[PDB]
């Protein structure tokens, strides 16, 4: 199979809700070396988001049965071994994505939009490992996550409007990173309240093909605010 | 629960 | 791992919504030879239900894009190949289950309840192949589906109350078999109106451990009736 | 759509 068929095969997989399938497809596309199109770059983002999401789900659930079974020795051993199992899978999936971003996506971003998007992806995927690390390793990969987000946050502010969906998105997550990982609520609030307030102040910069997305992410940001103050 | 790009 | 651990490992997989894992777990249990307990029997029914269901889902969806892309030659070739891929998958899953019923579950049913259950399962799983067969092969596997259901339907009426959930369940599906496979709406309605009306007539026979299930299936039956007459 | 044991 060539590029055009793989994109199509990936678009079917998505309809079929078969994300490991949709995934591998893009993984091939990416490995061929050529820089991804906006369309192509999202199929990859969605595929992996989907693959990784199910594991983080599986994990969260099993993880919080370990706690419940405090006191049930034989049950909790069962959980821990299964947890580790899921935790492994999860970690391969992250390594994949991050190793794809190192070879191909990042060094190839001829454009600010590309760079910010794939740097956010880096930040995101380390973040996912930080949910699940690990002691000793945690500190290192928290930093790796922080610096990717940082670069991207600065490159976004310099090159993109406050109403750009990628810049709004990046904020939402970076915020979450400061909240759940660095355990720093007020920073997290501050950062999200800025991204929101600056986009609210600039509503007329909304290009037609994304006023929905920017809008959504704006609602998402104010939600986090509502919850983190509650 | 909080809402990230990766949600839901 | 021994039996007691596998049951528990399976029960976690179910929590983790990871049905391939839940599945293989029971597949082991069953292969050890001992007759399954009511709890163990259902873990297997649910495991496989879920495993098969995802692929019948992905199938239906892709299958229905083949149609849509009538006229788009290159798109439709892509769908057909992916369809066949899913169809393959689905067929192993059915073989598996059916081959597990042949060695183990059926010959071991020391009790009517077991026999009906596992025979319905047979009827069900061939049905799933009938959705997807095949020309030539269709005829044969439609029949194998029919006769499993038949035996089961007869053994149920002899041994079980109308308000037994397995007897209600069996009717629901056998009905659907008549409707969608044998393409015989009249019989399908008749069969389901009987199962319903006989259970409605006898509401006082509901053991407490199942009045919810019986009840539910009863609603499902009348639903099908509402739809098939509409 | 119809309702079967294998349903939803």
């Amino acid at each position: 199979m060539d590029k055009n068929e793989l994109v199509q095969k990936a678009k079917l997989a998505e309809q079929a809700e078969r994300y490991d399938d949709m995934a591998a497809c893009m993984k091939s596309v990416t490995e061929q070396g050529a820089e991804l199109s906006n369309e192509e770059r999202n199929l990859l983002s969605v595929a992996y988001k989907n693959v990784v999401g199910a594991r983080r789900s599986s994990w969260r659930v099993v993880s919080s049965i370990e706690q419940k079974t405090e006191g049930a020795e034989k049950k909790q051993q069962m959980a821990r071994e299964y947890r580790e199992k899921i935790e492994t899978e999860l970690r391969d999936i992250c390594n994949d994505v991050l190793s794809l971003l190192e070879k191909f996506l990042i060094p190839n971003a001829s454009q600010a939009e590309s760079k910010v998007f794939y740097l956010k992806m880096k930040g995101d995927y380390y973040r996912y490992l930080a949910e699940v690390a690990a002691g000793d390793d945690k500190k290192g990969i928290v930093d790796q996550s922080q610096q990717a987000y940082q670069e991207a946050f600065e490159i976004s502010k310099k090159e993109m409007q406050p109403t750009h969906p990628i810049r709004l998105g990046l904020a939402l997550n970076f915020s979450v990173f400061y909240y759940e990982i660095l355990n720093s609520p007020e920073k997290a609030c501050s950062l999200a309240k800025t991204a929101f307030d600056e986009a609210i102040a600039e509503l007329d910069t909304l290009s037609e093909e994304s006023y929905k997305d920017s809008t959504l992410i704006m609602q998402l940001l104010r939600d986090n605010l509502t919850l983190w103050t509650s | 629960a909080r809402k990230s790009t990766g949600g839901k």
Side-chain angles (χ1 to χ4, degrees), chain A residues 1-229, chain B:
Chain A
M1 287 200 190
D2 88 278
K3 207 283 309 288
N4 279 314
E5 290 182 64
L6 287 168
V7 159
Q8 287 301 300
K9 197 151 179 302
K11 290 155 150 282
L12 294 187
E14 166 177 32
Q15 286 295 131
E17 303 201 69
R18 282 179 54 101
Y19 290 119
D20 315 306
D21 263 20
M22 183 204 200
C25 270
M26 302 314 308
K27 157 147 187 275
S28 310
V29 171
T30 289
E31 275 162 353
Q32 303 186 342
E35 216 217 284
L36 305 190
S37 67
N38 268 258
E39 198 209 313
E40 269 150 22
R41 162 245 283 177
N42 301 328
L43 294 165
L44 184 85
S45 194
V46 166
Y48 271 105
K49 168 213 197 179
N50 273 297
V51 158
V52 88
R55 272 104 217 162
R56 302 163 63 207
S57 184
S58 276
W59 197 88
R60 271 182 249 107
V61 161
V62 168
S63 181
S64 86
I65 280 171
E66 280 209 74
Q67 270 94 136
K68 288 281 131 60
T69 57
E70 170 114 12
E73 183 194 22
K74 257 151 62 197
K75 278 173 184 170
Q76 191 189 255
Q77 187 195 34
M78 216 82 286
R80 204 172 83 259
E81 286 165 347
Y82 203 34
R83 169 166 86 37
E84 266 143 36
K85 204 219 199 212
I86 292 144
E87 196 156 85
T88 307
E89 309 203 292
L90 217 152
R91 218 174 264 127
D92 309 76
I93 283 126
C94 288
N95 294 345
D96 245 20
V97 183
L98 288 158
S99 196
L100 246 7
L101 285 158
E102 291 299 314
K103 308 263 174 69
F104 311 103
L105 306 161
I106 300 168
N108 289 209
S110 59
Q111 311 174 349
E113 187 198 65
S114 260
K115 222 96 156 69
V116 174
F117 177 101
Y118 299 123
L119 284 165
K120 179 190 150 297
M121 211 166 182
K122 172 134 161 262
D124 275 353
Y125 278 94
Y126 276 96
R127 208 229 296 147
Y128 301 153
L129 294 171
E131 292 180 326
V132 143
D136 298 284
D137 311 317
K138 203 187 183 217
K139 273 158 197 173
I141 81 204
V142 166
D143 279 342
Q144 277 261 230
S145 203
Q146 185 155 34
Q147 278 162 357
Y149 283 149
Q150 203 46 65
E151 190 164 5
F153 187 65
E154 284 151 357
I155 311 194
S156 71
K157 277 220 204 323
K158 165 153 183 179
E159 318 288 6
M160 287 155 142
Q161 295 281 8
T163 44
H164 188 118
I166 306 199
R167 203 185 119 163
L168 278 181
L170 163 68
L172 180 83
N173 292 6
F174 207 166
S175 180
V176 172
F177 178 94
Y178 276 106
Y179 195 105
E180 281 183 23
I181 307 318
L182 265 33
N183 218 79
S184 209
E186 162 263 269
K187 232 161 203 165
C189 284
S190 103
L191 174 43
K193 179 156 190 298
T194 307
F196 183 92
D197 282 354
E198 279 181 1
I200 216 91
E202 268 204 26
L203 281 176
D204 66 353
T205 50
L206 287 155
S207 84
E208 224 76 327
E209 65 276 334
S210 43
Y211 92 110
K212 264 106 185 298
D213 307 270
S214 304
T215 264
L216 216 329
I217 296 151
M218 261 159 55
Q219 290 175 241
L220 293 191
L221 288 155
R222 191 169 108 260
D223 283 357
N224 289 3
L225 270 294
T226 339
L227 179 95
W228 288 336
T229 56
Chain B
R2 28 116 310 177
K3 306 218 251 284
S4 58
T5 266
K8 50 288 210 297

